[PDB]
Amino acid sequence: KVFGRCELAAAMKRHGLDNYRGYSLGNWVCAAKFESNFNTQATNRNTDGSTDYGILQINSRWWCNDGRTPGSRNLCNIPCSALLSSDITASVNCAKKIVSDGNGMNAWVAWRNRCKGTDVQAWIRGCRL
Ligand SMILES: [Cl-]
Ligand SMILES: [Cl-]
Ligand SMILES: [Cl-]
Ligand SMILES: [Cl-]
Ligand code: NA
Ligand code: NA
């Protein structure tokens, strides 16, 4: 599913991401924009042989099982395919675990390089929330 911007903001808000660990909703929408272009089905292979999955491009080396990342963990206790669903629940629950990890949203490279330090509230402007 390719979400609309405000559609995704509302989904993320209902799932409790607004101000989760102090990260306002626009941070999460911005991250999704530049990680996946709002496409839940996005998959991208990484140089280390892991793969990133879903609307927040969550990685198989640590967070989900894809059966093809030797030595990896599955800290969200899910198949990586669960991160590709049109329903964002699994991605949200896993993202909450990731961001409670020590580095916060710096775990997301697109957030760090394209959202951090910017006017992220622009990503929710105009939306009915
Ligand atoms: Cl915001
Ligand atoms: Cl594996
Ligand atoms: Cl293994
Ligand atoms: Cl949803
Ligand atoms: Na894994
Ligand atoms: Na990445």
Side-chain angles (χ1 to χ4, degrees):
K1 172 174 172 176
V2 177
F3 276 79
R5 179 181 62 93
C6 293
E7 183 187 18
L8 181 62
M12 286 176 157
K13 180 170 180 186
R14 104 175 175 85
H15 279 107
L17 283 178
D18 180 27
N19 301 318
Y20 192 87
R21 296 303 186 261
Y23 291 93
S24 63
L25 188 57
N27 281 285
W28 297 101
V29 175
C30 186
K33 168 70 184 179
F34 294 126
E35 291 290 348
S36 70
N37 207 13
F38 299 148
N39 187 348
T40 69
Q41 296 195 85
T43 62
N44 288 287
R45 197 73 183 263
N46 290 26
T47 56
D48 73 346
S50 69
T51 302
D52 294 329
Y53 296 85
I55 202 157
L56 287 169
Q57 291 291 278
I58 289 171
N59 186 261
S60 64
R61 183 153 303 285
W62 299 103
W63 303 107
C64 60
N65 178 54
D66 67 5
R68 69 169 198 192
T69 311
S72 70
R73 305 298 181 90
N74 177 12
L75 291 171
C76 294
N77 303 296
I78 51 166
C80 297
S81 63
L83 299 168
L84 307 178
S85 176
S86 60
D87 174 352
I88 68 172
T89 301
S91 283
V92 172
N93 283 329
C94 190
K96 286 179 175 176
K97 184 173 279 101
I98 295 163
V99 76
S100 304
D101 211 84
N103 290 1
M105 288 197 73
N106 295 287
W108 285 276
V109 62
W111 178 85
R112 193 165 194 268
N113 291 154
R114 307 180 70 180
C115 303
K116 185 182 190 179
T118 76
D119 179 12
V120 297
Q121 183 142 207
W123 286 101
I124 64 172
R125 277 201 236 300
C127 303
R128 185 149 191 98
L129 294 166

